[PDB]
Design a protein around this ligand. Structure first.
Ligand SMILES: Nc1nc2c(ncn2[C@@H]2O[C@H](COP(=O)(O)OP(=O)(O)O)[C@@H](O)[C@H]2O)c(=O)[nH]1
Ligand SMILES: [Mg+2]
Ligand SMILES: [Zn+2]
Length: 398
């Protein structure tokens, strides 16, 4: 209903203005929000209600027109995905393209076009085939007219031949809220709500799981927080969760898919009877809180019984390594047998042991099983020194 209809990724080089623009659009100038941010994926969702003024016709994200003061009309709710660092957003796009319906590429007008990070974010969009792009030429008030036009030409040159070739370039000042109405209008024109088939099997990627019952009769079942990427969820629905609950058998860890029932659904800031793709959805269940407490189910996948992707203990991956540009160490060394990698697929995260090599392929034994479909994309990271670094992605093969 009134919940977010699309997730918009905020991309661009660090310091160019992604967070400032997100706050300008969501109207957040205070405050924490650090409770709906992912754990397996360093992601945060922030909703905004796009509205249009009947009087002057300009778009904004406020019930009160910033331009004439008139009350605006509701158009659509959207959600912006803004992440802390470069590495984070990159991993997020490669592992969960199903989480983004479009993207706003922020490029600071007072910076040398182009910079490595910007190049890598566009490379990520290219890989996942995300073409609903809008470019925000930020900090426009910091440059003169000549430099502004020149920067525009460089961006244009830069996007030619890419998934962003058809993107509009909108000059703005995210900090001062300049020309924001033109950008909001562009979100409606270039990031339309996709025509989704509401009857495809439902599938939600669990981002978080909690026990809402307070410190110290509403001993409420466990709650799952996540993204619906296909179909829809409805109160009363019977759902299965995979891989499920860990248990020990003969000294080793196994996982038992678990079935429960949806008792409540929160989306757009309120309880609803049905939830769909777009923004975060809080799923209240009948599960024993002890099972969801402390994000024990983060990374799991939710769907209707008998209609979930398979669970894998090991993966055969068609590997595509990145031609890395963002401290030297650009050259990505080939993956060797016995190497331990970090894999991200959907909202799931697990280390993996390379057990075999093939033509543009690797076999990997997973530390923690994952629920995914053949063909799904997996972000691959290698430990460089003391930190994990993204080096490419793999496609699950049977
Ligand atoms: N002058 C000016 N500074 C801006 C503008 N937009 C963002 N900034 C500033 O530039 C810095 C980087 O912005 P931030 O939003 O944190 O962007 P991020 O690092 O891409 O996510 C902050 O100090 C902002 O206040 C703008 O339009 N004009
Ligand atoms: Mg930021
Ligand atoms: Zn108005």
């Amino acid at each position: 209903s009134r919940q977010a209809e699309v997730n918009i990724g905020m991309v661009g080089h660090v310091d160019h203005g992604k967070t400032t623009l997100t706050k300008a659009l969501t109207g957040v100038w205070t405050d924490s929000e650090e409770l709906r941010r992912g754990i397996t994926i360093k992601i945060g969702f922030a909703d905004a209600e796009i509205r249009r003024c009947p009087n002057c016709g300009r778009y904004s994200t406020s019930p009160v027109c910033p331009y004439c003061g008139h009350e605006t009309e509701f158009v659509r709710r959207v959600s912006f995905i803004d992440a802390p660092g470069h590495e984070a957003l990159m991993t997020t796009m490669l592992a969960g393209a199903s989480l983004m319906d479009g993207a706003i590429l922020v490029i600071a007008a007072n910076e040398p076009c182009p910079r490595p990070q910007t190049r890598e974010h566009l490379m990520a969009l290219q890989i996942i085939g995300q073409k609903n792009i809008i470019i925000a030429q930020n900090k426009i008030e910091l440059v003169d007219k000549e430099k502004a036009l020149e920067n525009y030409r460089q961006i244009k040159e830069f996007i030619e031949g890419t998934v962003a070739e058809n993107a509009p370039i909108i000059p703005i000042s995210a900090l001062h809220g300049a020309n924001i109405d033109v950008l909001v209008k562009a979100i409606e024109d270039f990031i339309p709500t996709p025509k989704r088939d509401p009857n495809k099997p439902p599938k939600m990627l669990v981002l978080r799981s909690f026990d809402v019952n307070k410190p110290g009769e509403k001993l409420v079942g466990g709650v799952l927080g996540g993204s619906i990427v296909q179909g829809k969820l409805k109160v009363g629905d019977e759902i299965e969760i995979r891989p499920g609950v860990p248990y020990e058998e003969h000294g080793r860890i196994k996982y038992e898919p678990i079935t429960t029932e949806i008792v409540s659904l929160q989306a757009g800031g309120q309880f609803v009877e049905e939830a769909y793709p777009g923004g975060l959805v809080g799923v209240g269940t009948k599960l024993d809180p002890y099972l969801t407490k402390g994000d024990l189910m983060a990374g799991n996948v939710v769907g209707k019984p008998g209609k979930l992707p398979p669970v894998w203990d090991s993966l055969r991956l068609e590997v595509h390594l990145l031609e890395r540009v963002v401290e030297q160490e650009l050259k990505v060394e080939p993956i060797k047998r016995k190497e331990v990698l970090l894999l991200n697929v959907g909202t799931a995260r697990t280390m993996g042991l390379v057990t075999g090599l093939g033509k543009d392929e690797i076999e990997v034994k997973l530390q923690i099983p994952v629920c995914a479909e053949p063909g799904d994309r997996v972000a691959i990271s290698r430990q460089i020194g003391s930190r994990w670094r993204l080096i490419g992605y793999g496609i699950i093969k049977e």
